[PDB]
Amino acid sequence: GPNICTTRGVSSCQQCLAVSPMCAWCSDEALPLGSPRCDLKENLLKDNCAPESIEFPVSEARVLEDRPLSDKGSGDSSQVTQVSPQRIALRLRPDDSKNFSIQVRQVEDYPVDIYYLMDLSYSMKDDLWSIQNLGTKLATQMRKLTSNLRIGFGAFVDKPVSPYMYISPPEALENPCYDMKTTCLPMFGYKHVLTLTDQVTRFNEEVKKQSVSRNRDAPEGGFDAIMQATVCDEKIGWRNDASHLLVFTTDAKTHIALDGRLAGIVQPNDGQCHVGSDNHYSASTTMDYPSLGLMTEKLSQKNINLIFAVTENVVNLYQNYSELIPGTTVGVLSMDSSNVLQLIVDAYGKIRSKVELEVRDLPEELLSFNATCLNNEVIPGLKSCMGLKIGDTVSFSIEAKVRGCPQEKEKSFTIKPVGFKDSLIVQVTFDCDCACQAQAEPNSHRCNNGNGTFECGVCRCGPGWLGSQCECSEEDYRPS
Amino acid sequence: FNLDVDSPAEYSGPEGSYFGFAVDFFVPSASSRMFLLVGAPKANTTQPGIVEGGQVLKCDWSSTRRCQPIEFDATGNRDYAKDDPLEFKSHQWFGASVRSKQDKILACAPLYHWRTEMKQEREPVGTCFLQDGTKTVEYAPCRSQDIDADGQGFCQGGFSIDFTKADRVLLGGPGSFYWQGQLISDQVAEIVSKYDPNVYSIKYNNQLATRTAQAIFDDSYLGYSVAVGDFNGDGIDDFVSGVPRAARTLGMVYIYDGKNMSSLYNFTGEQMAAYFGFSVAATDINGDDYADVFIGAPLFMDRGSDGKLQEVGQVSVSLQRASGDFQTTKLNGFEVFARFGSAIAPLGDLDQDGFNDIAIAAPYGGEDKKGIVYIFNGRSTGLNAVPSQILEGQWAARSMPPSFGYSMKGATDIDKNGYPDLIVGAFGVDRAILYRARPVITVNAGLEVYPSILNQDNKTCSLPGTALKVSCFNVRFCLKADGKGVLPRKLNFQELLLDKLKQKGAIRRALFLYSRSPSHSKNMTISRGGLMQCEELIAYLRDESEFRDKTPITIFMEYRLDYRTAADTTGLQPILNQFTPANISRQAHILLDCGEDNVCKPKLEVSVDSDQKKIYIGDDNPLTLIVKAQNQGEGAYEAELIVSIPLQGVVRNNEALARLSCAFKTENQTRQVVCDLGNPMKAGTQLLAGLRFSHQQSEMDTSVKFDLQIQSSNLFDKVSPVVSHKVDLAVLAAVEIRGVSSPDHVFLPIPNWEHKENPETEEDVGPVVQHIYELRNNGPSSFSKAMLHLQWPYKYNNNTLLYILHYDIDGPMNCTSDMEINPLRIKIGDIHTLGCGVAQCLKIVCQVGRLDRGKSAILYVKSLLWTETFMNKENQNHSYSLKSSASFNVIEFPYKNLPIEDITNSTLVTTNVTWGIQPAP
């Protein structure tokens, strides 16, 4: 017996189907008229209204196109595929639901940003090839690990003020190395050279075009370069999504905060961006060197991993400095670039990624995801797996529960993992209609000019009307 | 509490001149006027051809707060050869370091540049100008024939500066010997003596200086900061210098002998790049004869609350203990990026009642990063590692941080208070501030009541006006004041209270006799140097007669000083010592009866009994209650008997029980009766009172549970046994039935009556006979249903006796006859007894409903006297009594498990028939 289907009222095939999917509509004379056409499926099957006269839809979730997720990101063999199925068709009912699976794989390489500060004081002239080789292989070996890389350039000597720079002869003021009968450039401070760009050749070949300066005191002002490379996002060109690495080169000790007192520079560092239109650090001679705590704060605030590339004679000093900068590392600036490329690889190996799902074009009538994450955690409720790595897979599940029937038949909605070049859409389609009355026969003379709705073979008469064609009146119908 | 943080003097210099970068006090031995010295290393000067060659200003105290330049020199550069100057005095930072002692002023320009006589050059050797009276001279120990950076070139001499005892300057050049830094010390007399303006490499014979160390010591900045104190015992000020970059930037502080510049002791920091040594100070902060060294590490990073590091800074205090041994504590900062430890300014005796004190500054902390300073006082055990006061900046950055507290100087009394004042530099705003120290008044207090532990009120004191005799206890309180500084001999004060517990809303208790109030206050003058001055007071004790108010009573007071009237003529105001409390109290207690123990165990008993032990609920029953109680412990102090009552006086009628006052209420739905035994109830004085409650209608309910428990003043739960009464739920069920007849007797023959063939009217048969039966309840119990029956004589000797016509009913009952009523359908000679036992019986059977006190059910029956049975020949002259009877009993009660009772009552009524007109004899 129908607990719902018939007890909520029966008026037409469309209204009959407006009830939950548990109900169907019969339109044949194969059984007596003891109950409306909306008897429940258990009654429909046994009473067995004619098979050709049953209006019983079933939701269909079918793949429209499903190109499998690629296991390689190489362009020589694939265009990569990150979400599947790309499009699934959905036949729907105004109160039905059906399972709809979806899958994600991280295939495209992680974006990286490696910026390279240069020590160009006269101290470095003895091993300039070391720093140049390091700058070259930073690019060349990272192109061998990731295809989404951007590299930049910068230099530092020291604040162009006494007692750091030779102001004494006019010759020295434009060629400090005069006193040694040799030529070298005037002192910079800190000056940005090449903005972050993907052109390896330009950076690789333009590294070789830099040369040394000279200052007096052994400590060099590299910390100002650190602070300005970190905080000047526009000039540097840091990219929001990419992993940021900063490689800092130096051969000697470092000017730490409060060392600027000797030069009359008693203004604390503030971390603002001061690189000018000429790409020089304007406040180089106005602002003291930065504090390790301030450097750590600004280095974490902008997600930078700093790697010290220093020579064998200062490794211990900078290691001990490293522990005061939590998260920093350090390597030898030997003639061969080893032990700093290792730190770069190790940094790449720890940048895990997130897979969040966002939806657009989704109408109000249609579910929240249950996320199955790595290590086969099948957790309901959660819809955003974290800690993923390239080559891994995460699976999501959703069912298209319906809240009603919309204005028209055809709609769609698009799902997209955040930050992915791939996405999928469903051409969701709702079958609220019925084929019985589409024949235009209703309200004809065969239904007594509209005294009943045509069931595609028999007229369903309204109150006060009776007969297959509504040719009789209930008030006049009497025993005879 | 010590330093005046209100109305401190402010000094301003030219904009962007860094006025206040270095500060000091000027103390002329020639005259009594005191001057401040403030350095403005970036001020533009009237020198010819010099751009911001620096300045030093003598800021007065006080006519108009003016700051006047000191004309150390009035000349620009000088020529070595034409178009070949030897000297470059622009941007030289004159005033970067200022220091004074008696009539001598020594200021230096660390960034003065000169051209070496051996080559064309510009080297910042640094130069100092020393004034001693009007005899100004130039002291430039680093300007020499040691020319290059390898020597005293770039010496930056005068970066750090200090004198000693006697007269011998200490000078620190951080740049000498490839920035190893160095110290140079000379006699002021020798500096003045060997000056001629035409020599550029002047040499001093009694000079002590450090020398080139191994290259591994380069960039140590020895002499970044310097201080002097005796640490070897010879009584000559030894040299202490901060080396902020030493030992892989950990930071070291060196100590050098003050007579031959030999190395005594070395200190090391513990955190790299903390700049351990940015500021140093030598002071003895524990009263000993031995001087302790302080060291600043403004960039110190320590693990915070969340486990992460944070630049807070710190100060390390190393006490000197008579053997050359040093025991070191540490003092961390309180804010991030405040650089706590930037400046360390010894004050000494700031806590006049104590040992030397020290101030420590964090110039980039505080609100809006305007700078803050911490004051720490020293104790015999060492330094009070918790700050004692807070000073912070009061201006906005323009555009660089105000840097309030970047440089300070204390240990001098400008306004002759007797204890050091403090000068603060705020060069970021081009301002420096002077903080005056306040005079400490120390007050010791005490109040006593020797009649403490009053036992009996002893009412003898005359209550004002009414002259009533009342109780009392003597109360007195005294104070004594002293102070080491210059503060008036007319200290002024203004209170004392009679209770501390009662401050929460409660009953009044005692009062001050003449004051009539629970608290009082009255001013007095102390004079600042006398013995305790005071007088006693007279307290009107209360109460136990109207307020039942014997927990202890507390006496408490505090002293109200006023700083306004005691303000110093210079505008300052005195202060009270920090750790002397304003609260002081003595309470003891008051005793009446119980024994010498803190509990005074209230072992007692209570019992109850019921007059009627079966309830009989049918009305406002006379129910009465009997109670008793006794004391076996030390006594009950608040022996209140509480009794709970059901949903439901008089007992004073007689002296049968030991009656005493009670009361009733239903506060917060807790229906209760309150009866008092005593306050206290006297020991061994058992009592028994009695009680009465008396309508109830609840069905199947017996929740009456009168109970007892006694209150007291004991500190523990003192829960007495809860004894309760008992009554059983039962009711009496008396019921009875009664009736009456009309007429009672009849005389035959009936008037104008004659025999009938068949009767159809009432008068055809005979006169009417009517009976009435009445059933009523008597006992409290009410039954649910009941039955009653009537017995009627119908026929005897085959003749009718009484002929019933109909019956009527009143009340909740119904009836039906066992034989047809009015079967013939009539239109509506001694006495002999007849009835159902002789005559043929007729019965009326009836049911009844619920009856109750005063409720009734009545049955009426109408009948006719059958005249034929007594007028016929064989029955003439006869007499008969045609009586009838009724009976009833209960069949159901509204309860089943409760006791039940039945009834057996019955009643009969008379009706006599007699012959009146008898034949004559």
Ligand SMILES: CC(C)[C@H]1C(=O)N[C@@H](CCCNC(=N)N)C(=O)NCC(=O)N[C@H](CC(=O)O)C(=O)N[C@H](Cc2ccccc2)C(=O)N1C
């Ligand atoms: C040994 C010498 C060849 C070497 C050096 O370091 N000398 C020391 C002084 C040691 C004695 N200290 C005393 N207290 N007496 C020194 O001067 N350190 C500071 C400096 O020289 N800083 C500059 C910055 C710069 O110009 O980049 C720079 O590095 N100088 C050269 C660099 C150099 C030398 C030789 C070959 C290539 C590069 C330097 O290291 N010294 C002069």
